[PDB]
Design a binder for these strands. Structure first.
Ligand SMILES: [Zn+2]
Ligand SMILES: [Zn+2]
Ligand SMILES: [Zn+2]
Lengths: 110, 97, 103, 95, 82, 92, 103, 82, 97
DNA sequence: TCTGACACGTGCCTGGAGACTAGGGAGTAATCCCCTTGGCGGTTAAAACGCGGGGGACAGCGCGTACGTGCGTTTAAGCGGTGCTAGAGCTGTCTACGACCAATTGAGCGGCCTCGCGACCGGGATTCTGAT
DNA sequence: ATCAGAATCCCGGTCGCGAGGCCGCTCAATTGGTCGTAGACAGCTCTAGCACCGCTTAAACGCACGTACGCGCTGTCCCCCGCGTTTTAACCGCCAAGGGGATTACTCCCTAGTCTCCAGGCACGTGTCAGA
């Protein structure tokens, strides 16, 4: 009867595409064959990391009372979380600026 | 006349430019520099606007990070002004020869 | 961001009652105006516009001076004109605008 | 005559509506999360390929993905990310 | 078409602004030439790699992706133009 | 069983120094160096093949990878020592 | 009749082809790719071996040990830059003392 | 069980490592800092070595696992089968 | 009796240990430390001898490089002795902090 | 003198080489348009100079802390044996799993268009320093 | 410490370009079946970690002593910062060409792929020589 097709991401309960990730793995010449539980794991991991960065960036924008994330709200969302900072420690972000940080030695005396 | 004590506008500028995000080098001089440098390697080259913009963004990020390291080297030596020897020490420790 | 109405003249999001266009040929949201804009532009208020059965949106009568409609007419942008009308003794800019055309 | 190219903007946006229902994202920031996804994907896939090659295996499986996530991601992330992926995989088992 | 003496276009106020973003408060008068040299070396490396990629592509134009790959090869991954 | 670059590195050493031998630990170090450089160049050539939408690794990919990794005089020399082999293969 | 003899190299070419195919760098490997790769590997190994042999000769020794390799890499600028983040077992370090340290 | 073995990295051993580094005078508080730094580095390498070993379902940490763990951190080590 | 001035034996061992190439930490204490550290990751592990030897080589190389950078930092601040702040600065600039 | 680590000698496979093939990757002509290259005029903001002077770099001095050098005591690292067994390698069987392949159908990409957000000014507080 | 220049939010007016969605195709993800082999499980074997015991005896370790050098204090020029003036090239909005990145249509020849055979490295086994 060939019941109505459902995307493998739906079976995995995801939002990132498991099928596209499978195709990218197979065509990206990483190994001769790839399993059925590799794309699911990788897509879930990418979805989770994106979810955390978006969680932090939305708050970073809200404290700036803005209703549209810009690159700045990513940098403030990245260099403030120690683990996310460690994961992306060798990455530059275009139009991201930098955290405000003045050394205590330079601050005015008295 | 009102005259700020030396160093006040330095902290004011520090706050103002650490708050912002725009590029600090003017676009035309950097475009000229990029073209001049790239003309050596290959002749009659062409650059996408995105290429020049990406190069400028990378250069500003690198210089800002190097200046943070230089400032740390300056503060280490019981100083407030960054000198060339601080830049040299930061570049030597970072492994940038 | 998902609840507030947007005025046609000011084109911002705010929580306020806005008038409606009763023209059967009227289309879109362009029949909605906020009090601060219409009271500063034409001397009309929210209450009287709501209560009038034959009241039409300023675009319906052709007296809309919104920048979008002003550009659709092929003529420049008004900007801020309230104080210019006040200095000239005009209660609303529409009378000031009509007087400017007459002059 | 289209040059249509794939991009995760359909998902990067759609997962943003599940975590911040009333917050947008600029097209200059969509092209940054796109690169973040395209970078982490390559990192984990390359590590999985290396792990598969070390053990003389030819099949990349969820064990190599799990070990790659454990190797790259630091701290609670590696403790949390894995707990996500496993769930998905085990859900996949139930179909 | 040719150009000469463009590294002086990296002005003293521009370098001072880049240092201000870096958090420095006082600037020695001798760091401007040092920063110009450092920037020139960094640009030389990245542009050489980018033009190498462009040449391998059999292209007379340098695109953003060539620059991004050139930067990634040095461990300076750039987000926003890829 | 296990393979290595022992025979080939020994041949090269005898060619460049007729009266010099090599130690087992240093021989393993040379094996590791050869493996590391081979991995680096092969991976970079794979990356260029992927970037330009090419399914074949050719001499051009290897040449550009050599130009990308090897610094300064090491690159221009190695390229000249690389193509000289390939053209020889053309002559057969 | 081996592939190395045709290309005139002492490094393998068939083995390099097998390692290119079995290492899934690409789906197809060209004819001259293993030849070019083997020639470049041979050149780099020859340079390293020449430098190490000169260092051993200046050391009054017959066998090359890791110390000689470390000296050869750490003295040649280009080879040091190519191997800037590599540790050599029992390779030691270049003897160097800062000027201010000296009496 | 094993404990306090970080004290087994004696003060003269740190002295020898520093002398090989090229330092001539050492402050008295250097030793504890060096012990902490070494412990952190060792933990970082050993974690990945044990991860590599566990991925292969082995109870023995081979030299190649340590080689891979060191390579992961950009500290490639030659001469141990790499 | 004969007594070398302070710093003479310092340079003597500096030259002696940059001349040498062997391991400077005792084998047994380092092996015990490695086993204790690895005890917290997997219970009842076993170590190949070459594994512990490789760990010792890597650790010694790392510490020697760190001490080189620390000496550079100390010299920058117009000093001869190395203090913990120099190690901290070197590790911060290297990206380890 | 003696230590053995390294130099070959020789079976021996077992990976490499030679012929032949078919199919798909990739040069090549043949546009097409788009998006890089220029001129060109204002103009305004931003770089460049000049000058006063104040805070900071740099050298000197002195006292005291803390480290290097040496010596006698101790103590465990290192070496050499000796069993013992956990477990790393290796092989054999065969089964579950992933690749390859023809429909086919919907998810996502391009264009569109309008709605809401992120900007500009223009007067009034609101801090923010500086000298007294 | 209080008052006044000076810089800066702040909250009213507008406006303008982009960002959410929305509709139409079209390209690729999904379904299903078949088939080959890659990895899993079971025995077997030999290795090589691991535990102990003694025995020297270099190396660590406490204390003593002296002095080198880190660190706080003064001066003292002097170099960089802040501000006013001038000037000059970046920026913005236009037009104007055309060079080349991009995309089809061949079509040709380069390279997996199969089979057969064979000689180049590998391991076991010594033997002269570096050199510790
Ligand atoms: Zn309104
Ligand atoms: Zn209407
Ligand atoms: Zn209107």
């Amino acid at each position: 009867a060939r019941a109505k097709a459902k995307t493998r991401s739906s079976r995995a309960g995801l939002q990132f595409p498991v099928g596209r990730v499978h195709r990218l793995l197979r065509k990206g010449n990483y190994s001769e064959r790839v399993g059925a539980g590799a794309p699911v794991y990788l897509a879930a991991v990418l979805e989770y990391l994106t979810a955390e960065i978006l969680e932090l960036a939305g708050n970073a924008a809200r404290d700036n009372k803005k209703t549209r994330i810009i690159p700045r709200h990513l940098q403030l969302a990245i260099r403030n979380d120690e683990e996310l900072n460690k994961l992306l420690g060798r990455v530059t972000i275009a139009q991201g600026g930098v955290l405000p940080n003045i050394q205590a030695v330079l601050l005015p005396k008295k | 006349p009102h005259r700020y004590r030396p160093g006040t506008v330095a902290l004011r500028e520090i706050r103002r430019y650490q708050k912002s995000t725009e590029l600090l080098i003017r676009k035309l001089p950097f475009q000229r520099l990029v073209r001049e440098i790239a003309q050596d390697f290959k002749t009659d080259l062409r650059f996408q606007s995105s290429a020049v913009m990406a190069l400028q963004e990378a250069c500003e990020a690198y210089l800002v990070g190097l200046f943070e390291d230089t400032n740390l080297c300056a503060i280490h030596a019981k100083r407030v002004t960054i000198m060339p020897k601080d830049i040299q020490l930061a570049r030597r420790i970072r492994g940038e020869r | 961001r998902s609840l507030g109405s947007t005025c046609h003249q000011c084109r911002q999001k705010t929580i306020d009652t806005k008038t409606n266009c009763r023209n059967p040929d009227c289309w879109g949201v362009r029949g909605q105006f906020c009090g601060p804009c219409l009271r500063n532009r034409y001397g009309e208020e929210v209450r009287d516009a709501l209560l009038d059965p034959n009241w039409h949106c300023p675009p319906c009568r052709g007296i809309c001076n919104c920048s979008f409609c002003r550009q659709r007419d092929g003529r420049s942008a008004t900007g801020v004109l309230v104080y210019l009308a006040k200095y000239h003794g005009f209660g609303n800019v529409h009378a000031y605008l009509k007087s400017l055309k007459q002059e | 005559k289209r040059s249509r190219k794939e991009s995760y903007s359909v998902y990067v946006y759609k997962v943003l509506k599940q975590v911040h229902p009333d917050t947008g994202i600029s097209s200059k920031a969509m092209g940054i999360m796109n690169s973040f996804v395209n970078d982490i994907f390559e990192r984990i896939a390359g590590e999985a390929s290396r792990l598969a090659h070390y053990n003389k295996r030819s099949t990349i499986t969820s064990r190599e993905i799990q070990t790659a996530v454990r190797l790259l991601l630091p701290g609670e992330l590696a403790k949390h990310a894995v707990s996500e992926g496993t769930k998905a995989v085990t859900k996949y088992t139930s179909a | 078409k040719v150009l000469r003496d463009n590294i002086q276009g990296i002005t003293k106020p521009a370098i001072r602004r880049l240092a201000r973003r870096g958090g420095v408060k006082r600037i020695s008068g001798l760091i401007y030439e040092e920063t110009r040299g450092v920037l020139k070396v960094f640009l030389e490396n990245v542009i050489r790699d980018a033009v190498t990629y462009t040449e391998h592509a059999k292209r007379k134009t340098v695109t953003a992706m060539d620059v991004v790959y050139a930067l990634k090869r040095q461990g300076r991954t750039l987000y926003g133009f890829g």
